[PDB]
Amino acid sequence: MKNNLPIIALDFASAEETLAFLAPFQQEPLFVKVGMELFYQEGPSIVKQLKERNCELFLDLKLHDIPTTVNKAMKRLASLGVDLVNVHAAGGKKMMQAALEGLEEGTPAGKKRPSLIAVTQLTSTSEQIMKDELLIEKSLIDTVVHYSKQAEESGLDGVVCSVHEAKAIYQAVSPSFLTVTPGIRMSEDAANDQVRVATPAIAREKGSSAIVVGRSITKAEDPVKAYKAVRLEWEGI
Amino acid sequence: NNLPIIALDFASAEETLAFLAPFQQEPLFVKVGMELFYQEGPSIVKQLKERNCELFLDLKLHDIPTTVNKAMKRLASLGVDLVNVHAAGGKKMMQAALEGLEEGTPAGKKRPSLIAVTQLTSTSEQIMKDELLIEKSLIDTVVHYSKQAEESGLDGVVCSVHEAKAIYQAVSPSFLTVTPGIRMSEDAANDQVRVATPAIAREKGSSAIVVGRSITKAEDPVKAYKAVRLEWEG
Ligand SMILES: O=c1ccn([C@@H]2O[C@H](COP(=O)(O)O)[C@@H](O)[C@H]2O)c(=O)[nH]1
Numbered sequence: 001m002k003n004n005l006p007i008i009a010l011d012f013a014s015a016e017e018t019l020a021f022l023a024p025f026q027q028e029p030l031f032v033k034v035g036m037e038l039f040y041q042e043g044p045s046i047v048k049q050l051k052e053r054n055c056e057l058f059l060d061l062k063l064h065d066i067p068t069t070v071n072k073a074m075k076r077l078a079s080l081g082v083d084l085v086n087v088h089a090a091g092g093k094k095m096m097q098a099a100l101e102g103l104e105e106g107t108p109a110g111k112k113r114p115s116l117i118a119v120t121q122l123t124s125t126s127e128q129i130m131k132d133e134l135l136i137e138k139s140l141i142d143t144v145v146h147y148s149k150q151a152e153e154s155g156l157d158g159v160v161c162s163v164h165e166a167k168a169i170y171q172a173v174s175p176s177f178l179t180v181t182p183g184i185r186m187s188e189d190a191a192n193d194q195v196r197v198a199t200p201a202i203a204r205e206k207g208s209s210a211i212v213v214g215r216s217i218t219k220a221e222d223p224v225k226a227y228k229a230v231r232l233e234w235e236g237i
Numbered sequence: 238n239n240l241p242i243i244a245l246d247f248a249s250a251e252e253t254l255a256f257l258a259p260f261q262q263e264p265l266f267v268k269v270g271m272e273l274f275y276q277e278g279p280s281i282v283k284q285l286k287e288r289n290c291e292l293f294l295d296l297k298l299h300d301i302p303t304t305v306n307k308a309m310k311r312l313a314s315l316g317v318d319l320v321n322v323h324a325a326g327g328k329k330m331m332q333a334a335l336e337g338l339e340e341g342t343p344a345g346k347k348r349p350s351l352i353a354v355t356q357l358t359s360t361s362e363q364i365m366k367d368e369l370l371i372e373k374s375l376i377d378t379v380v381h382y383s384k385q386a387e388e389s390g391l392d393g394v395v396c397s398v399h400e401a402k403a404i405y406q407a408v409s410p411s412f413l414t415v416t417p418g419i420r421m422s423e424d425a426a427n428d429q430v431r432v433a434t435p436a437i438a439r440e441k442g443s444s445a446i447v448v449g450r451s452i453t454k455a456e457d458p459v460k461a462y463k464a465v466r467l468e469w470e471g
């Protein structure tokens with residue numbers, strides 16, 4: 001199970017900035033991502049605005065709280081009409097299950113429940129930071145595999161991980177399990193706070209289901225040329 | 238903090254306002270979580286602040302450093318009193334959150350206090366070992382995450398009542414311990430594991446208590462809050 005459209009991370013301070021950026025893409029089919037920055041400024045109105053513009057939407061809020069709060073918060077998000085939403089696998093199985101139940105109960109009859117994925121280890125987290133600061137003694141790749149397996153056992157559709165863990169995840173989980181991979185940059189682009197990086201080309205090779213691309217498109221001199229170059233490499237030209 | 242933080246775990250602004258109505262003009266420390274905020278957005282924070290409520294925005298930011306920094310700048314325009322991140326995000330991330338918070342806060346306005354979630358009050362040691370893969374004890378992990386938060390410049394942590402004494406042995410006395418997992422004597426524990434009463438929270442050195450269902454699911458919420466308040470003060 002793979003997604004053809006690169007998920008564009010709309011990391012802007014306002015709806016206005018977002019809509020200005022999206023202006024040259026008016027006739028293009030889009031898969032966009034609304035994160036904490038844009039959502040905490042505008043609220044549910046921005047999700048509604050982008051849905052009216054027929055964009056496929058990933059609401060990347062990474063819910064990490066107690067089982068009942070995540071369950072109740074997912075009921076609110078399922079009422080919004082998003083296509084993909086997420087939680088942290090570091091919240092445990094009971095929490096990931098409650099999240100799934102929340103999405104199921106909050107989704108009206110006639111429409112499909114939003115796809116739910118779990119964040120394993122953030123693409124900005126190195127093995128050294130994971131061992132010393134988080135106190136996880138296992139290797140990063142093993143922790144990601146374990147977290148992905150916990151997500152599947154909980155009834156989830158997939159995970160957020162880096163491209164370099166995708167092959168190992170598929171040795172433990174089902175082939176239809178989603179691997180949504182951020183930490184994507186072009187060859188001549190800066191890594192920023194990302195530590196486990198890959199090009200759209202390397203992402204296709206290692207078997208990523210979907211790629212989340214932000215700054216490589218948004219902070220480029222020509223975002224239109226950048227999105228075209230990202231998609232060509234992702235499709236195989 | 239003399240005022241127990243009420244967890245406004247409601248599905249809309251109207252259900253929150255209707256809960257808050259019998260309290261009238263009494264000073265309240267309230268908490269807006271994921272449920273209320275993801276439904277109403279920034280508007281609910283702006284509404285509660287006009288009724289002179291002390292506010293805790295419990296969104297528990299857990300993302301990459303730059304996203305948390307940028308997101309904290311947006312939350313700092315809302316004028317809240319307390320906000321949080323997950324310590325499981327690392328030091329670089331907690332530092333970025335502090336920077337975003339101090340940068341986004343308008344001049345003349347007080348910078349919102351930033352606290353870090355250690356291990357959720359609903360997480361047990363078995364779940365922390367088998368599922369999260371942390372081989373160290375829950376208590377030692379909470380103390381380590383508290384130290385990471387302090388070295389990052391944060392004001393405190395969210396932990397359970399049972400870790401407070403252990404945290405204070407490693408951190409500064411001015412460091413905050415905001416403690417949820419609060420239930421009265423006969424109240425059902427629900428999904429909470431490391432439970433305590435408002436009285437035991439006072440005895441173990443908690444800075445503030447977050448109370449939800451013991452108040453919100455009671456027959457008379459105002460009477461329930463008073464019982465929780467008097468047990469917390471003395
Ligand atoms: O493990 C993860 C999960 C999510 N994101 C998100 O994906 C986007 C990647 O941004 P950029 O590094 O491509 O510009 C951001 O909105 C960020 O919050 C990551 O970077 N890593």
Ligand SMILES: O=c1ccn([C@@H]2O[C@H](COP(=O)(O)O)[C@@H](O)[C@H]2O)c(=O)[nH]1
Nearest residue numbers: 066069244270357358417447448449450
């Ligand atoms: O470790 C933590 C951190 C935060 N909360 C929050 O505090 C409130 C406590 O709910 P209740 O168990 O008192 O009803 C909830 O909104 C929840 O999200 C916890 O319960 N545990």
